[PDB]
Design an enzyme around this catalytic site. Structure first.
Site, PDB file in Angstrom:
ATOM      1  N   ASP A   1       0.762  -1.249   0.000  1.00 31.83           N
ATOM      2  CA  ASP A   1       0.000   0.000   0.000  1.00 31.83           C
ATOM      3  C   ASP A   1       0.800   1.310   0.000  1.00 31.83           C
ATOM      4  O   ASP A   1       1.269   1.764   1.045  1.00 31.83           O
ATOM      5  CB  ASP A   1      -0.945  -0.034   1.209  1.00 31.83           C
ATOM      6  CG  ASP A   1      -1.830   1.189   1.303  1.00 31.83           C
ATOM      7  OD1 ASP A   1      -2.088   1.810   0.253  1.00 31.83           O
ATOM      8  OD2 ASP A   1      -2.281   1.513   2.426  1.00 31.83           O
TER       9      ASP A   1
ATOM     10  N   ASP B   1      -1.909   5.744  -5.088  1.00 32.49           N
ATOM     11  CA  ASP B   1      -2.284   4.805  -4.030  1.00 32.49           C
ATOM     12  C   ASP B   1      -2.557   3.364  -4.495  1.00 32.49           C
ATOM     13  O   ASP B   1      -3.617   3.082  -5.047  1.00 32.49           O
ATOM     14  CB  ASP B   1      -3.541   5.396  -3.370  1.00 32.49           C
ATOM     15  CG  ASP B   1      -3.945   4.692  -2.088  1.00 32.49           C
ATOM     16  OD1 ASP B   1      -3.464   3.578  -1.823  1.00 32.49           O
ATOM     17  OD2 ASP B   1      -4.775   5.270  -1.351  1.00 32.49           O
TER      18      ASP B   1
HETATM   19  C1  LIG Z   1      -7.366  -3.152  -1.391  1.00 28.28           C
HETATM   20  C2  LIG Z   1      -8.294  -2.892  -2.582  1.00 28.28           C
HETATM   21  C3  LIG Z   1      -9.781  -3.046  -2.207  1.00 28.28           C
HETATM   22  N1  LIG Z   1     -10.340  -1.874  -1.477  1.00 28.28           N
HETATM   23  C4  LIG Z   1     -10.895  -2.046  -0.116  1.00 28.28           C
HETATM   24  C5  LIG Z   1     -12.240  -2.805  -0.131  1.00 28.28           C
HETATM   25  C6  LIG Z   1     -13.370  -1.977  -0.761  1.00 28.28           C
HETATM   26  C7  LIG Z   1     -10.379  -0.586  -2.126  1.00 28.28           C
HETATM   27  O1  LIG Z   1     -10.313  -0.498  -3.342  1.00 28.28           O
HETATM   28  C8  LIG Z   1     -10.516   0.709  -1.352  1.00 28.28           C
HETATM   29  C9  LIG Z   1     -11.610   1.582  -1.617  1.00 28.28           C
HETATM   30  C10 LIG Z   1     -11.751   2.805  -0.901  1.00 28.28           C
HETATM   31  C11 LIG Z   1     -12.913   3.728  -1.188  1.00 28.28           C
HETATM   32  C12 LIG Z   1     -10.786   3.150   0.085  1.00 28.28           C
HETATM   33  C13 LIG Z   1      -9.693   2.283   0.352  1.00 28.28           C
HETATM   34  C14 LIG Z   1      -8.666   2.611   1.395  1.00 28.28           C
HETATM   35  O2  LIG Z   1      -8.950   3.283   2.379  1.00 28.28           O
HETATM   36  N2  LIG Z   1      -7.387   2.075   1.208  1.00 28.28           N
HETATM   37  C15 LIG Z   1      -6.237   2.218   2.142  1.00 28.28           C
HETATM   38  C16 LIG Z   1      -5.650   0.792   2.250  1.00 28.28           C
HETATM   39  C17 LIG Z   1      -6.726  -0.184   2.725  1.00 28.28           C
HETATM   40  C18 LIG Z   1      -7.571   0.126   3.844  1.00 28.28           C
HETATM   41  C19 LIG Z   1      -8.576  -0.781   4.268  1.00 28.28           C
HETATM   42  F1  LIG Z   1      -9.344  -0.476   5.294  1.00 28.28           F
HETATM   43  C20 LIG Z   1      -8.751  -2.010   3.585  1.00 28.28           C
HETATM   44  C21 LIG Z   1      -7.917  -2.323   2.480  1.00 28.28           C
HETATM   45  F2  LIG Z   1      -8.072  -3.453   1.842  1.00 28.28           F
HETATM   46  C22 LIG Z   1      -6.913  -1.412   2.055  1.00 28.28           C
HETATM   47  C23 LIG Z   1      -5.227   3.287   1.681  1.00 28.28           C
HETATM   48  O3  LIG Z   1      -4.169   3.333   2.591  1.00 28.28           O
HETATM   49  C24 LIG Z   1      -5.874   4.665   1.715  1.00 28.28           C
HETATM   50  N3  LIG Z   1      -4.915   5.695   1.348  1.00 28.28           N
HETATM   51  C25 LIG Z   1      -5.469   7.033   1.525  1.00 28.28           C
HETATM   52  C26 LIG Z   1      -5.640   7.277   3.041  1.00 28.28           C
HETATM   53  C27 LIG Z   1      -6.837   7.831   3.571  1.00 28.28           C
HETATM   54  C28 LIG Z   1      -6.979   8.026   4.972  1.00 28.28           C
HETATM   55  C29 LIG Z   1      -5.927   7.670   5.864  1.00 28.28           C
HETATM   56  C30 LIG Z   1      -4.721   7.113   5.359  1.00 28.28           C
HETATM   57  I1  LIG Z   1      -3.170   6.574   6.674  1.00 28.28           I
HETATM   58  C31 LIG Z   1      -4.580   6.919   3.954  1.00 28.28           C
HETATM   59  C32 LIG Z   1      -9.559   1.061  -0.369  1.00 28.28           C
END
Ligand SMILES: CCCN(CCC)C(=O)c1cc(C)cc(C(=O)N[C@@H](Cc2cc(F)cc(F)c2)[C@H](O)CNCc2cccc(I)c2)c1
EC number: 3.4.23.46
Length: 375
Positions: A35, A224
């Site tokens: 990530d 990202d």
């Molecule tokens: C893995 C692919 C599948 N998924 C997940 C299932 C729907 C996505 O496509 C997806 C979709 C959305 C809308 C948001 C995120 C997301 O939040 N990703 C973070 C890593 C992550 C988080 C987690 F909760 C689950 C996951 F699988 C992956 C990433 O870091 C965010 N970077 C910006 C940031 C923002 C605030 C705070 C910080 I520090 C950083 C992933």
């Protein structure tokens, strides 16, 4: 850039790319989500319905408790845990072992994904966004400081009953020239927190969206790998969808499709790619007034799930997010040493018979500096 590092990434469509790592002594094997969107190294460390294995600190002779709690709230989900350090290695990465900070996850919400096959996350971004604060050294920083690995890494993310399996390579410490063709174009890392960049122009099938470029980075734009879709600020999103809709007006799809909620399918092998337009994102170059563009094909923004797909472009409220679907088909170099991110057409480049993903430059663009959000 080792041959032993090629194809060291795996995953399922829409569930992230992970790399195998070992933690502790003896080594405990775990699949870790790569990530570039965050900066904490965390691993499930307690039973969970979606975890088939997890980090057991008690079984590691080299584990050291830091006696400090930690919590990270992402856009998707969040987790809570306990801080400590231990030995970490990447079997199909550099042949070194480092002592790194590790957040043992004890509680989580909508973080782990059922069937994704990964048990932790490797935040490759900078300390500035690490939790609890920037004093918690991120993994890559520890790796560079403790070993002789160059301060750079590159990612080649490749495209595609169960979800289609995906693959790729994470080249740690260098650039593997066999993973790309053509020239590498670099955009500056605006600030060292997220891998922040600046988009100066956006075209849909050669047609300029004609927006004040500040809108493209409204708040910020980041690269990202931990997010699947290309996420766009409201105003930009609406303009983009409106344009894509018009280009594919030959056929009609439900609003659920455009909202990336429901899928759309076609007779196996008939997906009319030609009706969907290419999207060109112009990134600020290393020289003032100079930019380059990366062109994305529909094969990229229409994610596989009759052949069924989901619209992999969605609205964001926290800036532009160049997710995995944008990175796929390109070889992306995270040149931390020279504070820049490079793009080149990937060896597993984006497809088509009449079209193809591209990275082309230079294109003169005046006042690129005023495209960013000034704190
Ligand atoms: C893995 C692919 C599948 N998924 C997940 C299932 C729907 C996505 O496509 C997806 C979709 C959305 C809308 C948001 C995120 C997301 O939040 N990703 C973070 C890593 C992550 C988080 C987690 F909760 C689950 C996951 F699988 C992956 C990433 O870091 C965010 N970077 C910006 C940031 C923002 C605030 C705070 C910080 I520090 C950083 C992933």
């Amino acid at each position: 850039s080792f041959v032993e590092m090629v194809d060291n990434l795996r995953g399922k469509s829409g569930q992230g790319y992970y790399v195998e790592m070992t933690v502790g002594s003896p080594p405990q094997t775990l699949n870790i989500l790569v990530d570039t969107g965050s900066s904490n190294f965390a691993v499930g460390a307690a039973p969970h319905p979606f975890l088939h294995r997890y980090y057991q600190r008690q079984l590691s002779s080299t584990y050291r408790d830091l006696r400090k709690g930690v919590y990270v709230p992402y856009t998707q989900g969040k987790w809570e845990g306990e801080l400590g350090t231990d030995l970490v290695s990447i079997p199909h990465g550099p042949n070194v072992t480092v002592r790194a900070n590790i957040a043992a996850i004890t509680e989580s919400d909508k973080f782990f994904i059922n069937g994704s096959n990964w048990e932790g996350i490797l935040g490759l971004a900078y300390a500035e966004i690490a939790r609890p604060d920037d004093s918690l050294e991120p993994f890559f920083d520890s790796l560079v400081k403790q070993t002789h690995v160059p301060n750079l890494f590159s990612l080649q993310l490749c495209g595609a009953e169960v979800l289609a399996s995906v693959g790729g390579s994470m080249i740690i410490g260098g650039i593997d020239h066999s993973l790309y063709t053509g020239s590498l174009w670099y955009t500056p890392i605006r600030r060292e927190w997220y891998y922040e960049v600046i988009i100066v122009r956006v075209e849909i099938n050669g047609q300029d969206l004609k927006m004040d470029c500040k809108e493209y980075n409204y708040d910020k734009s980041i690269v990202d790998s931990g997010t699947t879709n290309l996420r766009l600020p409201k105003k930009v999103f609406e303009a983009a969808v409106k344009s894509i809709k018009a280009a594919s007006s030959t056929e009609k799809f439900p609003d659920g499709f455009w909202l990336g909620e429901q899928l759309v399918c076609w007779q196996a092998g008939t997906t009319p790619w030609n009706i969907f337009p290419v999207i060109s994102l112009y990134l600020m170059g290393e020289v003032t007034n100079q930019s380059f563009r990366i062109t994305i094909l529909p094969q990229q923004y229409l994610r596989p799930v009759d052949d069924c797909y989901k619209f992999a472009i969605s609205q964001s409220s926290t800036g532009t997010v160049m997710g995995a679907v944008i990175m796929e088909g390109f070889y992306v170099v995270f040149d931390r040493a020279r504070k820049r991110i490079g793009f080149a057409v990937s060896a597993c480049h984006v497809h088509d018979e009449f079209r193809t993903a591209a990275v082309e430059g230079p294109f003169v663009t005046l006042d690129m500096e005023d495209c960013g959000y000034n704190i």
